[PDB]
Amino acid sequence: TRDANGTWEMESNENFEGWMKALDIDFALRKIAVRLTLTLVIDQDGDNFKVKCTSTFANYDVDFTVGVEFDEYTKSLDNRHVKALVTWEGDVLVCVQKGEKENRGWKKWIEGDKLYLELTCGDQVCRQVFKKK
Ligand SMILES: *C/C=C/c1ccc2c(c1)C(C)(C)c1cc(N(CC)CC)ccc1-2
Structure with missing residues (x-):
């Protein structure tokens, strides 16, 4: 359950527009993003991660080492420079992105066949659920 490897298909997506608005993503882009199918591919080898989020139009890839x-430059997102850090809090994978935005980051809970993702920015929280394909 510390093993996040897999191809993950989104099955639920709560308050996605509110999270993108907190990041100041263009209303235009928000409009397109809500309609697109998102696939989350994670390759994990020990502390080494490569994450790839793919859709019809956008692509968001990041590699990091735990701790x-x-x-990070969120070029395909809100185009900001943040200092990122990913750690384990028990079995929860936790990302803090230090920069202009407060409370910015995400958390991941892997529960068997399902991945729970909460993305945070400011006062907004987006909650996503994925199932392993
Ligand atoms: C552990 C998961 C982290 C994470 C980081 C960044 C993104 C995501 C998940 C997604 C899949 C929610 C996502 C989607 C997008 N685009 C739409 C706004 C689509 C590619 C960007 C970044 C992330």
Whole structure:
């Protein structure tokens, strides 16, 4: 349950527009993003992660090592520089993105066949559920 490897198909997506609005994503782009099918592919080898989020139009890929801070430029998202850090809190995978936005990051809970993802920015929380294909 610390093993997030898999191809993950989105099955629920709560308050996605509110989270994108907290990031100041263009209303235009928000309009398109809500309609698109998103696939989350995770390749994990020990502390080494490669995450790829893919849709018809957008692509968001990141690689990181657990417990090692890394500069991130969210080029395909809100286009901001953050100092990111991913750690384990028990079996919860937790990302903090330090920068302009407060309470910015995400958390991942892997429960067997299902992956729960909460994305946070400011006062907004988006809740997603994925099933392993
Ligand atoms: C552990 C999961 C983290 C994470 C990081 C970044 C993104 C996501 C998940 C997605 C799948 C929710 C996602 C989607 C998007 N686009 C729409 C706004 C689509 C590619 C960007 C970034 C992330």
